From a paper:
BthA is the first example of a diheme enzyme carrying out chemistry reminiscent of both canonical bCCPs and MauG. Our efforts reveal that BthA is a peroxidase, capable of both H2O2 turnover when in the presence of an external electron source, yet also generates the bis-Fe(IV) species, as determined by Near-infrared  (NIR) and Mössbauer spectroscopy. Surprisingly, the kinetic parameters of H2O2 turnover indicate BthA is a very good peroxidase despite its spectroscopic and electrochemical parallels to MauG. BthA is also capable of generating the putative bis-Fe(IV) species and produces an electronic absorption spectrum similar to peroxide-treated MauG.
The structure of BthA was solved using X-ray crystallography to 1.54-Å resolution, revealing the same overall fold found in other structurally characterized bCCPs and MauG. The 6c heme pocket in BthA is more similar to MauG, showing Tyr-His ligation by Tyr463 and His 371. In place of this interheme tryptophan residue, BthA has a serine residue, Ser257. Importantly, both S257A and S257W variants generated the bis-Fe(IV) species based on detection of the 960 nm feature in NIR and yielded nearly identical kinetic values for peroxide turnover. A final trait common to MauG and bCCPs is a catalytically essential Ca2+ ion located between the propionate moieties of the two hemes. In place of a calcium ligand, BthA contains a lysine residue, Lys444, which mediates a similar solvent network between the heme cofactors. However in the BthA structure, the ε-ammonium group of Lys444 occupies the position of the conserved Ca2+ ion, one of the notable differences between BthA and MauG, suggesting that the positively charged Lys side-chain mimics a Ca2+ ion. Notably, the crystal structure revealed the presence of a unique surface-exposed disulfide bond between residues Cys415 and Cys430.
Numbering used by the authors: 126 to 242, 248 to 543
Write the structure that this text describes.
């Protein structure tokens, strides 16, 4: 028995099934083994969908409204979003996403959900892995009242069917796209998958990529940061945000293994759902329960480790948008454990994890494993050097959006 976890990759041997059909596999998914066969006409249809502002209610919001091509397909936040929750605003005033949105560059390397050995979960789209594929993912934004707010697949089908996009989809997929709501959603997903898997959506054009391939050097400070990033006794970042500068092949450096961990970033008290003090976004365990994985609450507070390419142009950081500077996101790792009150709004422990799940939080990975009264693993100069290294991961098109002072905030329109 085998399963294919990335497009065109070799089938992987399945050793077991977890819950409703999540495969456990015998070997690590290798991103270099995927094969993305170009499909220019289907990818162009996906791009047409991506930029179509008729696909929201009220009209005016496209996928690009939260995934700006000018910012590595990460959000350029609206004024209300900047002034309030620091996550994307949806199609209406006063409605916002429940989480921050990531860059969609390199998203084609997010594998299907799987376990690999205890065995650990990997893959799935969204930060809680609740969509198995890009085709399934777009059901989220299309029908979420806090995002694009289409009322139903039936309503969206009727709307699209009256437009040129409807004609283009019917031309390619047949006339029933206008009469079968679930077929319409499925073929929107097929088109989108082709666009998001196209080569232009994985450019590998950063200065780090030039250092890996063309041997174009980084600065001494950037090299210090790279060494801290891979130092298990200081940054230890590479243990989750994995990289390999080998074979001059940039795709071995995606800065994530697509696994899950629980680092317990501070509560974003400006997020609407957090007005309820009993509400916590618990991440992966909600997906685990839907998939009937065993003992799903062991995964509460776990979130998918994000890749760090183009991180330095984002306007807010982490799944809840809680940090507004890259340096704060890095500094959090250094003193979360030694100085919890600085990070958790005065509390001595995590303020965005229910008491019931505080034991799920990682307190043994360096640098988050030092009790108060112990010196932190790194100095402030070390943190500065790590930021300098992360800034080398910006694709060439976008370097002007990084703050010119590295401790600052990304450029805003
Ligand atoms: C702002 C209101 C959004 C709009 C409009 C769209 N997306 Fe988005 N997207 C948004 C958020 C807040 C998130 C993360 C949510 C989570 O629970 O983690 C996403 C995520 C995606 C992803 C997954 C990326 C990954 O897991 O690495 C993809 C593939 C994606 N978004 C695509 C997508 C498309 C195709 C959209 C138009 C139909 C679309 N998004 C709109 C917020 C918003
Ligand atoms: C596994 C235990 C991790 C270690 C060690 C490090 N990171 Fe991490 N990182 C991890 C997760 C699960 C998350 C998401 C948490 C959430 O609440 O969303 C992150 C996130 C980041 C970010 C934000 C990226 C963004 O797109 O918002 C950055 C900037 C980042 N991590 C940096 C980073 C550095 C420099 C590390 C060594 C000091 C490091 N991380 C370690 C998981 C893990
Ligand atoms: Cl109908
Ligand atoms: Cl806050």
């Amino acid at each position: 028995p085998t399963t294919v976890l990335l497009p065109g990759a070799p089938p992987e041997r399945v050793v077991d099934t977890i819950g409703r059909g999540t495969p456990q596999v015998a070997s690590k998914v290798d991103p270099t083994a995927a094969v993305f066969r170009p499909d220019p006409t289907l990818a162009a249809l996906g791009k047409r969908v991506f930029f179509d502002p008729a696909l929201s209610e009220p009209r005016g919001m496209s996928c690009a409204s939260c995934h700006d091509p000018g910012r590595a397909f990460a959000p350029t936040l609206s004024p209300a979003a900047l002034a309030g929750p620091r996550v994307p605003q949806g199609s209406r005033p006063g409605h916002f996403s429940r989480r921050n949105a990531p860059s969609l560059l390199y998203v084609r390397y997010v594998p299907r959900r799987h376990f690999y050995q205890a065995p650990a979960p990997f893959g799935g789209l969204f930060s809680d892995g609740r969509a198995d594929t890009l085709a399934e993912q777009l059901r989220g934004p299309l029908f979420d009242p806090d995002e694009m707010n289409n009322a139903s697949a039936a309503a969206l089908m009727r709307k699209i069917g009256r437009t040129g996009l409807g004609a283009a989809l019917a031309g390619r997929f047949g006339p029933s796209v206008r009469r079968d709501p679930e077929r319409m959603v499925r073929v929107l997903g097929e088109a989108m998958q082709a666009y998001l898997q196209s080569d232009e959506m994985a450019p590998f054009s950063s200065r780090y990529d030039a250092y890996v391939t063309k041997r174009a050097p980084l600065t001494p400070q950037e090299m210090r940061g790279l060494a801290l990033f891979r130092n298990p006794d200081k940054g230890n970042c590479m243990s989750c945000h994995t990289l390999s500068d080998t074979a001059s092949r940039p795709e071995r450096s995606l800065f994530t293994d697509f696994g899950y961990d629980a680092i317990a970033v501070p509560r974003n008290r400006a997020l609407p759902a957090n007005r309820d003090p009993r509400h916590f976004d618990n991440g992966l365990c909600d997906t685990a329960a839907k998939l009937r994985w065993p003992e799903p609450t062991q995964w509460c507070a776990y979130l998918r480790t994000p890749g760090l390419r183009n991180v330095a142009i984002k306007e807010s950081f982490m799944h809840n948008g809680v940090f507004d500077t890259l340096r704060d996101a890095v500094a959090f790792y250094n003193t979360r454990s030694t100085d919890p009150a600085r990070w958790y709004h005065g509390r001595d422990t995590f303020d965005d994890v229910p008491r019931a799940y505080r034991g799920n939080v990682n307190v043994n990975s360096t640098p988050m494993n030092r009790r108060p009264g112990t010196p932190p693993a790194m100095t402030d100069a070390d943190v500065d050097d790590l930021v300098a290294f992360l800034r080398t991961l910006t694709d060439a098109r976008y370097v002007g959006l990084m703050p010119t002072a590295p401790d600052g905030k990304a450029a805003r329109p």
